[PDB]
Amino acid sequence: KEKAIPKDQRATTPYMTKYERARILGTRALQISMNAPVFVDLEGETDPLRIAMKELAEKKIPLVIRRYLPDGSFEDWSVEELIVDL
Amino acid sequence: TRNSLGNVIQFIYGEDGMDAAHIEKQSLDTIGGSDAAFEKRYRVDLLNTDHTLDPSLLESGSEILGDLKLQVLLDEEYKQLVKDRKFLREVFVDGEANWPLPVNIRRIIQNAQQTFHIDHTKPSDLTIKDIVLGVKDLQENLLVLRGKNEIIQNAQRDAVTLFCCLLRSRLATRRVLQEYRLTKQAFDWVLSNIEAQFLRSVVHPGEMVGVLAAQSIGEPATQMTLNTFHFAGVASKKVTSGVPRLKEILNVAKNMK
Amino acid sequence: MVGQQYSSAPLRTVKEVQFGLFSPEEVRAISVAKIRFPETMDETQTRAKIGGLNDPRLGSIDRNLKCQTCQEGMNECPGHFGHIDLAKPVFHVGFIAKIKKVCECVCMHCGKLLLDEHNELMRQALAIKDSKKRFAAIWTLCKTKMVCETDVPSEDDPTQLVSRGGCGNTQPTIRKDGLKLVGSWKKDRATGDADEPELRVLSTEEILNIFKHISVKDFTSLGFNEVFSRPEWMILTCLPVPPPPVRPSISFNESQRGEDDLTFKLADILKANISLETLEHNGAPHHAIEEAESLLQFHVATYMDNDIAGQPQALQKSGRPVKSIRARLKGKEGRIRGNLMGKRVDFSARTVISGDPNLELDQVGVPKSIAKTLTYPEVVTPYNIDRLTQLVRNGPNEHPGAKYVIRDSGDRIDLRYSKRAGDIQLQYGWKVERHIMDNDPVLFNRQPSLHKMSMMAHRVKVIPYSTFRLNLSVTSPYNADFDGDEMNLHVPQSEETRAELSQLCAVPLQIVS
Amino acid sequence: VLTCPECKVYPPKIVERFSEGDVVCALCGLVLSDK
Amino acid sequence: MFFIKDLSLNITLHPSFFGPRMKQYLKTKLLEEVEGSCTGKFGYILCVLDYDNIDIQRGRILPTDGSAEFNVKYRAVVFKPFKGEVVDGTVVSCSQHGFEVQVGPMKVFVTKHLMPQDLTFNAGSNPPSYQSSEDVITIKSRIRVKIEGCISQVSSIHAIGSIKEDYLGAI
Amino acid sequence: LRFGEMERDCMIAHGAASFLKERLMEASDAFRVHICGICGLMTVIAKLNHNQFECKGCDNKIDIYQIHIPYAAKLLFQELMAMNITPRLYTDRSRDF
Amino acid sequence: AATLQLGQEFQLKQINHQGEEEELIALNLSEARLVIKEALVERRRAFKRSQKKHKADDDDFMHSETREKELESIDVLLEQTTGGNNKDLKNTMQYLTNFSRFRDQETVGAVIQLLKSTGLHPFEVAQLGSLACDTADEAKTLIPSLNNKISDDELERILKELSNLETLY
Amino acid sequence: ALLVDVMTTQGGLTSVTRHGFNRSNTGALMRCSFEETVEILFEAGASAELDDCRGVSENVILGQMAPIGTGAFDVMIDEESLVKY
């Protein structure tokens, strides 16, 4: 647990890349398509990808991204606190 | 920028950390031109009749004249512009002005003029203090590297040097009040839009830049064969260039033709 | 979900690949069947001879009988290794140069390095961590000391001689003739004899004995390893025999088995070995023994590499060269560049293109039959069970429809033979392999794929006729026109893959190159 | 010997789908061996 | 032999169980999968201590299937013998080749070559047993067996023991 | 259809690892292999009906691992080992042993 | 473990999750049976408390009149706590109950104190708690580790005292 | 700029051939991928060379997920937000 960086000493970008966005959407779409509970008010949609986008819009995806520094340490960022451009 | 073993190839990608598709050709206006044109364009003086602001441009033009703090700020700005001219002429010894850079400031200013229906026939409600402080703060709010020790600070200033030079070149006080005639609302809008469009041009970690660079270099190499022999049209210029020259550069041949 | 079976061993991922070399002890311990006969299959011509090349303990490739060692079908048996014992040690064709180089750098009698810590140049060489340069420098330095020094001047005082235990004998000069390593002794001029270097072919067993006598400090200094890479192992004594998976037999009919080249070469190796053995115990003259050893060395050398410089090529009975192991891996079509970096795939199509001005920018027209052949494994959930049920009822001969139904347990029901298009009731977690339907992402490309923008994603629209459809503005990134060009279509098979094709490679996102 | 574990009918009726690399029982449609 | 050890396990939770009650599902999965199992590295898994004090680790969603894998550490009481161990046990079945003794959850077999000749097989007795001058061994008779070897598979461990020396048999 | 080297390079340029892995292994040739945890070789004999796992050379019946690799990689490793070279596969957490 | 060959997996010094060295813990039939019974009844009490949260009799289980009543309570406990899916646990518990030398906690504590007062190895102590030997030499032969380590008079005294401590059924 | 920096990063001019890149310190399978396969394999065996399986080629040979873009990070579950709902 020595690798983990304290929240105050986080020196990575506070925006989320396109790769992280695509990975998160894919994971959430798979979990929804495997009958996982939905955290938002579904309105007439039957596609897991669109419901994943909808959950992302209200920032309700309960996932955490771990970013690997080259030496081996890592930095943990919640999906709620990552700024997504539109 | 590193490799599979962890060896650093570049301490920053591209030396400024910018994506290759967020970069357009823009002209640095400080380099070229004679000293008289530079002095007329960028110098403003509140005590000499030669270089005063016409009071019909600034809403508070009558009262500001003769002040002391304002001329000190303008003098600092002009010293900065002079140092920028010296540095830019040190870098590009050829004197060329058009280089690729992020953010098209001209289009942002044109959009501000078109959206707010700015009428040039009326005085503007801007303040010299506000213009200078706003430009300096916007420079303070441009970030590519977010370290905390002095090394990262130096690296980040080195990265953003040239863009700060262009930004100072376009947003000079006389240019704002006399050439654009922006109001306070349009000025705030321009500053916010510039910061937002800059922050979206940084390169995304995870990008495989090696294969991108290799493909970029070696795609025109395929078409290079056709026009290699144009120098073959000059018999007395039998100098290797084209496919064989690139081959010799890559092989690091010890016996050139 | 690979193997169609269950095992309790945990799943893990490879992190390191530590290379090395077999010791003969390892070859013996690993092997399960000491091959003994130059024949494969019995005199009844119905079963393989036990102890032959096709011993059942190694395994079988056929789909009826199972392996004797593990009792598993041909789709689960990896294969097990045999071994063959050699009468006399044989040089390995891939380390002759290294053997000679390390032989010239070590005394032929005392089995020790010609230098030690006293010399400054040895300190410089031992200061280098890079093994390759270290060995190269040590070789180019110590190739010129033909006599071992008994006493060396002391570092503190050049007038003081310290004995290093050297034998003081004279080392030869070694040259290579074909597969033979011939030495020449240049006797000292003070001996009174002429300066005629006596020539002799060095015996492999003597060289093996010399190498076995080297120590650990010299192990590290030369650039070898104690556990994995001893030099004594560079000379062959036992030859491992690969299982029949590596050399599969192609059977046209019940009694028509065409065997691989590798098994023919191995049979010849064993035949020569038994001939040399039966001449060895019969008290034959030394000339015949030398000739038989040369033949054995030739066969073993050309079994692995068949392109050796300065030798004839081992030919087949029809005149073609024998495809050795090296020729399997070295080519462009070999394993590395033909079966591990690029390979043929499933769920793909290839067809000519055409132009459609009514299609949107990022939409591709897919023919009907190509849409009826490729599929997608959709998961049955509360939101789709009605449409999926109607799709299953439709069957496989109608678009839209389905072609297979996978249960929770991994079993897969072919909808065509099972009358149960109108019978199967679907549950939560089952999978329907349905046809590709409008607005499904696909990957689309043209060869050669020179740059990033030549492989892009698209949304499907099912159309009649046999061509693909494209918008007339994407033909520039593809460098493609419509006078006969064919392009390739690849279908993703998951949700993560679909999201990657829709958020990364889409045509809208590839406009500013 | 290859038999369907659900029909339990002897002798088993089996059809090989070569173009799909499958072995299929001709009664329940179950897929027995692949590739 | 009963001992306390520290154990860990990797448990995969299906995506359909992703809710606020995930800890309960993990606890049920652990209790239902681990208790009563046998591992050749640690013998039979008899019991798990401090059920309320189960240690947990953050999930790591697998990139291939979406099932969340968790690493769970705990302390457990387990049973495992060693070479040369002597254990009391209960006779299970009687045969001419020897006998079988249940000790804990395991079986140790003894072959007729591994007992002194004074013990003779009586088949006419009900049940058939081994009779000697002093010791009589039969069903439900406490018998001490010196375990000589053990064979470990995925789900069980068999043992072979000998009583060839003195002070062995009925107690 | 051939998914060549140029295609692999283009997919690396885009940055889609999952598509690459699915195309390479799940769509062409996936194989499951038991490897020894001590010598790191493919010599382990497994009787799956009786779940009997044995390493003959090292006398191992506990440390045995399941790995998912292509089939051509297994062929390459066997052909390498048929010439007295040892490609010894190891696991991340095998340094403890 | 004739020569106390416990291996790495069962070393005398154990490294716990807290990282501190501890003496290896060995329990005989009585100690293990009492521990597992206590754990099972505690788990049952926790389950009942949880059920009451979502929405007296336990004193009779621990105090058993007879072996048969104890076995019936054990069966009820397994039905209400285990689910009946674990036959090996039932067999182990039956083996513990049928051949438990000591039923009361205080007597088991007395046996532990008597065996570990001399400071013998935990393996030997657990073996002595599991095995009842009439003579010291019988135990010494059946426990080769006890040879050369304990005086015969002390072993005889311990064995006689343990035999006296056995509660009559 | 990247190509030039790669070509002159080892203190000297390293040509883009086998002599320059296939004689580097990189992984064995990576180097044997092109034009000198069997000899590099022989040398790696004889010197007991250790491969680390971190480059693209080593993760393509073994059929795994290379750390390339979407594969450069790990996705993990946050229990706090899940319980909070």
Q: How far apart are CA A30 and CA A52, in angstroms?
A: 9
Place of tokens 């001219």: B85
Q: How many CB atoms lie within 10 A of CB A71?
A: 8
**Helix or strand holding residue B102 (H, E):** strand B98-102
Q: Which residues of G44-69 are buried (b: 16+ CB within 10 A; e: fewer)?
A: beeeeeeeeeeeeeeeebeebeeeee
Look up residue H28 and give its two tokens. 């064995």
The whole-angstrom distance between A39's CA and the closest CA on chain E is 10
Residue of E nearest to C428 (CA): E16
> Measured between CB atoms, does C120 come within 8 Å of chain A?
no
> Measured between CB atoms, does C429 come within 8 Å of chain F?
no
Q: How far apart are CA C269 and CA C86, in angstroms?
A: 10
Residues of H within an 8 Å Cβ radius of C? 28-29, 32-34, 37-38, 41-42, 44-53, 57-58, 60-62, 64, 70
Q: How far apart are CA C165 and CA G111, in angstroms?
A: 69
Interface of C with A in 378-397 (CB under 8 A): 379, 381-384
**What are E162's strand-pairing partners?**
E146
Q: How many CB atoms lie within 10 A of CB F26?
A: 20
Please report residues of F whose CB lies closer than 8 A to that of E38: none
Sequence letter at residue B208: M
Compute the Cα dihedral for A68, A74, A79, A81 and give only its sign. negative
CA dihedral A70, A72, A75, A78 (to 10 degrees): 100
Residue D1 annotated in ligand binding: no
Look up residue C489 and give its two tokens. 């279509």
**How does DSSP classify residue E127?**
S
Q: How far apart are CA B203 and CA B216, in angstroms?
A: 17
Distances (CA, A) of C435 to C370, C384, D23: 9, 15, 22
- So where are chain F's domains? 1-85
Is-cis flag, bond preceding C400, omega within 30?
Answer: yes
CB contact under 8 A, B202 and A18: no
If DSSP states are collapsed to H, E and C, what string results for E7-65?
Answer: EEEEEEECHHHCCCCHHHHHHHHHHHHHCCCEECCCEEEEEECCHHHCECCCCEECCCC
> Measured between CB atoms, does D13 come within 8 Å of chain C?
no
Q: Residue B36 burial (CB < 10 Å; 0-12/13-18/19+)?
A: exposed
Which of C360, C238, C264 has the alpha carbon at shortest distance from C54? C264
Q: Which residues of C266-305 are buried (b: 16+ CB within 10 A; e: fewer)?
A: bbbbbebbeebeebeeeeeeeeeeeebbeebbbbbbbbbb
Distances (CA, A) of A9 to A75, A76, H83: 10, 11, 27
Resolution in A: 3.3
Q: How many CA atoms lie within 13 A of C57 on its CB side?
A: 14
Sequence letter at residue C441: P
DSSP per-residue string spanning G109-156: HHHHHHHHTTT--HHHHHHHHH---SSHHHHHHH-GGGTTTS-HHHHH
Show the domains of chain E with their CATH numbers: 1-84 (3.30.1490.120), 85-171 (2.40.50.140)
CB contact under 8 A, E15 and A30: yes
How big is the C-F interface in CB pairs under 8 Å? 209
Please report residues of E whose CB lies closer than 8 A to that of G5: 82-84
Residues 6+ apart with CB under 8 A from G114: G158, G161, G162, G165
**What's the Rg (C-alpha) of chain C?**
34
Look up residue A51 and give its two tokens. 């419901």
Q: How many CB atoms lie within 10 A of CB A45?
A: 14
C488 with C349: CB under 8 angstroms?
yes
CB contact under 8 A, F9 and B215: yes
Q: Which residues of H57-84 are buried (b: 16+ CB within 10 A; e: fewer)?
A: bbbbbbbbbbbbbbbbbbbbbbbebbee
Q: How far apart are CA H28 and CA C496, in angstroms?
A: 32
Q: How far apart are CA B170 and CA G24, in angstroms?
A: 78
Residues 6+ apart with CB under 8 A from C131: C223, H47
CB contact under 8 A, E15 and A34: yes
Chains H and G touch (3+ CB pairs under 8 A): no
How big is the E-G interface in CB pairs under 8 Å? 115
Backbone angles phi, psi at B95, to 5 degrees: 80, 15
CB contact under 8 A, E46 and G17: no
CB contact under 8 A, H48 and C225: yes
Which of C185, C108, C122 has the alpha carbon at shortest distance from C152? C122
> Measured between CB atoms, does E20 come within 8 Å of chain C?
no
If DSSP states are collapsed to H, E and C, what string results for C312-330?
Answer: CCCECCCCCECCCCHHHHC
The stretches of chain G forming alpha helices (DSSP H) are 29-54, 59-62, 67-81, 87-98, 105-116, 122-130, 136-142, 152-165
Q: Which CATH class is domain F1-85?
A: alpha beta
Residue D4 annotated in ligand binding: yes
User: Helix crossing, C495-503 with A48-57: angle to 10°?
Assistant: 60
The stretches of chain A forming alpha helices (DSSP H) are 18-33, 48-57
Q: How far apart are CA C431 and CA C380, in angstroms?
A: 6
Q: Residue E145 burial (CB < 10 Å; 0-12/13-18/19+)?
A: buried
**What are B243's strand-pairing partners?**
none
Residue C188 annotated in ligand binding: no
**What are E157's strand-pairing partners?**
E152
Compute the Cα dihedral for C288, C291, C295, C300 and give only its sign. positive
Please report residues of B whose CB lies closer than 8 A to that of F12: 208, 211
Distances (CA, A) of F67 to C314, F40, F47, F62, H64: 39, 11, 16, 16, 11
CB contact under 8 A, C16 and H50: yes
Which of E43, E45, E109, E112 has the alpha carbon at shortest distance from E82? E43
Which of C510, C505, C483 has the alpha carbon at shortest distance from C353? C483
Strand E129-131 to E136-137 pairing: antiparallel
- Say which of H65, H77, H83 has its CB closest to residue E20: H83
Q: Residue D22 burial (CB < 10 Å; 0-12/13-18/19+)?
A: middle
C306 with C314: CB under 8 angstroms?
yes
Please report residues of C whose CB lies closer than 8 A to that of D14: none
Please report residues of C whose CB lies closer than 8 A to that of D33: 75
Distances (CA, A) of H81 to E59, H84, H85: 13, 5, 7
Q: Quick one: how far is CA C182 from the chain centroid? A: 34
Strand E98-103 to E86-94 pairing: antiparallel
Which of E104, E80, E50 has the alpha carbon at shortest distance from G35? E50
Exp. method:
cryo-EM
Residues 6+ apart with CB under 8 A from C387: none
Residue C505 annotated in ligand binding: no
Sequence letter at residue G157: R
> How many residues in chain C?
513
Q: How many CA atoms lie within 13 A of C78 on its CB side?
A: 26
The whole-angstrom distance between C328's CA and the closest CA on chain F is 9
CB contact under 8 A, A31 and E15: yes
Residues 6+ apart with CB under 8 A from C211: C102, C231, C232, C234, C235
CB contact under 8 A, E63 and C8: no
Residue C156 annotated in ligand binding: no
Thinking of the domain A1-86, which architecture would CATH place it in?
Alpha-Beta Complex (3.90)
